[PDB]
């Protein structure tokens with residue numbers, strides 16, 4: 001059924017790492033006809049397909065047993081590609097890369113990986129890929145979970161494997177190998193939210209001759225307390241497939257450490273530098289142009305004609321020429337924002353949930369433009385209702401100005417606090433409030449069906465007035481069920497003020513250094529997105545966003561060639577040697 | 578932030594209704610400001626041609642203004 | 658409301674010869690970092706006299722640790 005052999009049974013059932021049956025079975029296999037097909041026996045059931053004796057030896061941490069298995073000619077490139085050993089985590093399983101080298105690496109067994117790479121009989125292929133296209137480094141990235149001990153052992157194993165691979169194959173660049181999705185280990189770590197691995201990779205130093213070129217952090221010069229270091233920006237700002245900033249900024253909002261991954265040492269200063277060099281002036285220019293657009297729109301709408309039945313004839317006086325010019329400019333701006341919204345939605349392809357849980361401002365600007373277009377259509381159709389649509393554009397046009405509070409730290413954080421308070425707390429309050437309002441409105445309309453309480457709309461407005469301090473408890477009318485009406489109104493007022501008090505108290509549970517920290521990180525992420533969009537637009541056919549220049553870091557690769565890497569300078573001071 | 582919101586809604590209200598306490602920007606700004614201090618006017622006893630659109634604007638303004646006030650009050654407790 | 662004794666009893670492990678049947682928490686299998694465990698659930702879900710869940714839920718509110726006794730490892734997962 002499963003294909004289990006006597007060898008696998010002996011491998012599974014042993015005590016203290018020893019079972020003399022294994023050696024006897026191997027000797028009998030040698031003497032009978034051959035050992036090759038016996039030692040390399042493996043399961044055939046799809047749930048455990050591909051597993052052989054080497055995997056069991058590695059799992060049980062038995063060095064002598066795996067050494068014997070390799071000595072007898074065991075295949076060290078077998079793929080344990082059963083359903084148990086892969087993703088689709090709807091069931092028990094453990095994905096490790098399907099290969100014995102990846103299995104030893106992922107279980108923190110350094111001696112076994114060293115033996116597998118540097119044995120006398122059959123060395124392992126360090127560059128091999130599994131069914132998904134993942135190398136050993138991709139597997140190491142996959143098994144990370146950002147805890148302390150996990151990060152420690154994964155980092156150490158990653159460093160050791162990289163150094164050994166450099167020594168055995170000086171011409172091999174392991175970190176450039178991509179899986180089926182086109183992701184390198186750095187891109188995979190960045191997009192998956194593996195902050196501990198990213199923080200190691202981006203600023204690693206390897207102080208060992210003949211493999212110093214593997215480092216990404218160097219030292220340009222040193223004085224006494226002060227010294228200057230260089231950070232490599234290869235595939236950080238531009239990569240032509242997937243840069244770190246691109247995969248962090250444009251993630252799908254489900255990455256666990258989406259906000260925190262921008263706080264590592266090189267990226268924060270890189271984004272601040274990009275902001276300070278060229279992006280700030282363009283942002284302020286766009287803000288100014290939007291302000292001019294809104295002033296012209298407001299002035300044009302203010303002086304509309306009051307005659308009925310549009311369209312209106314153009315007169316020969318000056319004010320009408322200015323008015324029609326303003327109308328034309330407003331409609332042009334609406335068309336511009338309409339096309340920009342379409343371009344965003346087509347170029348990003350949001351997944352029907354990323355539309356609303358993120359990117360609100362795109363929706364708001366698009367809705368403003370839709371109102372403008374509906375106003376135009378009604379204007380030329382000889383309808384007077386266009387004014388209504390126009391004003392719903394105009395009011396929105398002012399509130400959308402809050403978009404430009406980013407670029408200023410305090411106002412940006414304040415706006416982020418506003419947005420989160422709306423999206424988290426108000427939605428819960430309004431549901432309960434509307435339930436109470438509708439219930440008491442129906443009761444009041446039923447009790448009194450005349451005199452300002454003959455409909456649900458009027459009664460709802462009259463009860464809403466009580467919530468804003470504009471109520472009416474005079475009781476001058478001669479109702480049939482007065483003294484029952486009074487009890488209902490008093491109960492409604494008391495319950496509504498209990499609800500308001502409870503809301504106010506509940507909102508204090510966010511000022512425990514909770515929102516204060518989540519904001520400023522959300523603001524930094526927003527400004528990062530703005531920087532990336534501005535760079536991608538660039539408005540001039542100019543792409544001079546590069547950093548400190550083609551500096552020479554080491555200049556001595558394993559070959560005679562010298563290397564240049566577009567580094568970023570950081571100067572530091574330390575008064576404790 | 579409050580002044581930006583007030584100016585925007587005042588211009589919208591003057592444009593929608595051009596007579597009867599809403600024929601100037603100063604008067605409309607005062608009338609909308611009265612809501613913030615609990616002295617508003619939601620009687621709707623006049624015969625405006627754009628009634629029932631005016632109500633929606635006033636309700637939206639009131640809700641947004643109280644959102645801003647709540648956000649201020651909560652945010653200012655981070656200094657305590 | 659003896660939280661400590663309940664927490665001990667519900668997940669005790671006795672690994673010794675001739676008396677391991679006294680355990681209520683067992684190990685089904687172990688891969689490397691991953692493994693699977695089994696909880697007994699005898700007289701937790703139903704026993705027709707006094708189950709743990711019925712006793713905790715329908716207490717008279719004078720029990721000290723009425724809220725915390727449902728946070729022990731098997732009961733929270735069972736209820737979810």
Ligand SMILES: CCCCCCCCCCCCC(=O)O[C@@H](COC(=O)CCC)COP(=O)(O)O[C@H]1[C@H](O)[C@@H](O)[C@@H](O)[C@@H](O)[C@@H]1O
Pocket residue numbers: 357358359360361362364392395396399400402403418419422522525526529637
């Ligand atoms: C006439 C009636 C008028 C009604 C107007 C109603 C208020 C207008 C307010 C205008 C503010 C414009 C704006 O700036 O939009 C705000 C949110 O808008 C709202 O509150 C909508 C309320 C519905 C920011 O959204 P943002 O596009 O920055 O997305 C954020 C990411 O960038 C970030 O990384 C985080 O992932 C974050 O979780 C994301 O949100």
Ligand code: NA
Pocket residue numbers: 468469470615616
């Ligand atoms: Na009042």
